[PDB]
């Protein structure tokens, strides 16, 4: 109608550990989103949506990279 | 038979600019891969596979994050 359709509207509100993260996803602002949404895939086979607006998200995510890079 | 099946075998060998990157993907070692494979999605609607083994990959990718975060 007049608004966009971001791939993820509601984000997560519970800090956790990359211990349950096997795949990370990131989608920059698009024709459906005027911002940034960091999507992720939990090993349990689930896909959640985090918000960079939270400091703990920048940490648990940075850790995933440090682990995926050290591997 | 005895080897694993990584999601991406052949990587890219041509440094480019995030200017053509709309979505980033990262999969840590799994039951199919004993390493790390940084997958990505070009705006043209294509999915390639980069290798962290290249320094330029760590740069064009770091830029994508700086842009997706600044947005």
Commentary on this structure:
The structure is a homodimer of 71-residue chains. The first copy, chain A, has one helix at 55-70, and strands spanning 21-27, 38-42, 46-50. Chain A has 71 residues and is of the alpha+beta class. Chain A has one domain (1-71): OB fold (Dihydrolipoamide Acetyltransferase, E2P). The first copy, chain A, has a three-stranded antiparallel sheet with strand order 1-2-3, with helices on one face. The radius of gyration of chain A is 13 Å and the shape is elongated. The termini of chain A are far apart. The interface between A and B is medium-sized, with 19 and 19 residues. Strand 1 of chain A pairs antiparallel with strand 1 of chain B.
Annotation keywords:
homodimer; 71 residues; alpha+beta; OB fold (Dihydrolipoamide Acetyltransferase, E2P); 3 strands; 23% helix
Short description:
The structure is a homodimer of 71-residue chains. Chain A is α+β, with helices and mostly antiparallel strands and 71 residues long.
- Number of E strands of chain A: 3
Report the CATH architecture of chain A.
Beta Barrel
Helix content of chain A: 10-25%
**Total count of domains of chain A:** 1
Give, in spatial order, the strands making up the sheet with the most strands of chain A.
1-2-3
Q: Within the CATH hierarchy, at the fold level, what is the topology of chain A? A: OB fold (Dihydrolipoamide Acetyltransferase, E2P)
What is the tally of helical segments of chain A? 1
Beta-strand percentage of chain A?
A: 15-25%
Largest sheet of chain A: 3 strands, antiparallel
N→C terminal distance of chain A: 46 Å
Protein name (chains A, B): IL-8(7-77)
Disulfide bonds (chains A, B): 6-33, 8-49
């Amino acid at each position: 109608a007049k608004e966009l359709r971001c791939q993820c509207i509601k984000t997560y509100s519970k800090p956790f550990h990359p211990k349950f993260i096997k795949e990370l996803r990131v989608i920059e602002s698009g024709p459906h989103c005027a911002n940034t949404e960091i999507i992720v895939k939990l090993s349990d086979g689930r896909e959640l949506c985090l918000d960079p607006k939270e400091n703990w998200v920048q940490r648990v995510v940075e850790k995933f990279l440090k682990r995926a890079e050290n591997s």
